[PDB]
Amino acid sequence: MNLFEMLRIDEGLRLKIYKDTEGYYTIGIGHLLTKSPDLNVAKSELDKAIGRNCNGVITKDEAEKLFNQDVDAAVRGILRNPKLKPVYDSLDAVRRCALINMVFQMGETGVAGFTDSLRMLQQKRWDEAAANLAKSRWYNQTPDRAKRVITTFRTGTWDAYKNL
């Protein structure tokens, strides 16, 4: 399965400049256009981003590029953090998608302050880490997503995404 799909399910794919929880113009799978309260700037950013005259609308094949981009940025930010690097680095392919899905949801910073759980993950105490995450505020905000991600950590499979 994939990150995209994964994010696709967890996040949601929007094809029209929409407003963030924070109120920042966003689009695709949580792709941020601008912090500027100006729709006319999201636009510009977008087009700037897309390479065409969008009109505040893109197309999936497009949301996925934005996506793949936004993704490798995250990853580099992950490797730059000296506190996320060892974990991520130790994780397997599927557990990594779980880290990423998190960074995405909370940024490289909010994620890095899961001092404990991170250690467990690093250590391989799947049930512990998970139990751990289960306590967070995070998990209390966005449960279904949290469940899936924790589960994936624990199990280390897509099972959590297979029968939605």
Backbone angles phi, psi at 127, to 5 degrees: -70, -30
The residue to which tokens 């006319």 are assigned: 40
Terminal Cα distance for the chain, rounded: 14
Which sequence spans correspond to the domains of the chain? 1-164
Residue 20 annotated among the catalytic residues of the structure: yes
**Collapsing DSSP states into helix, strand and coil, what is residue 15?**
strand
Helical axes 143-155 vs 126-133, angle rounded to 10°:
170
Q: Which pair of tokens denotes residue 90?
A: 């130790």
The span from the CA of 118 to the CA of 11, in Å, is 23
Q: How many CB atoms lie within 10 A of CB 164?
A: 7
The one catalytic residue in 5, 10, 20, 38 is 20
Q: What is the resolution of this structure in A?
A: 2.5
Tell me how the structure was determined: X-ray
Asked if 8 contacts 17 with a C-beta cutoff of 8 angstroms, the reply is no
**Multiple choice CATH, 1-164, 3.90.550.10, 3.40.190.10, 2.60.40.10, 1.10.530.40:** 1.10.530.40
Q: Is 104 annotated as a binding residue?
A: yes
The residue to which tokens 């794919």 are assigned: 13
The one catalytic residue in 11, 45, 62, 108 is 11
The span from the CA of 1 to the CA of 86, in Å, is 24
Sequence letter at residue 41: V
The residue to which tokens 């880490």 are assigned: 129
Asked if 154 contacts 145 with a C-beta cutoff of 8 angstroms, the reply is no
Q: How distant is the alpha carbon of residue 160 from its chain centre? A: 16
The span from the CA of 7 to the CA of 145, in Å, is 10
The span from the CA of 158 to the CA of 133, in Å, is 18
Q: Is 114 annotated as a binding residue?
A: no
The residue to which tokens 């199990």 are assigned: 155
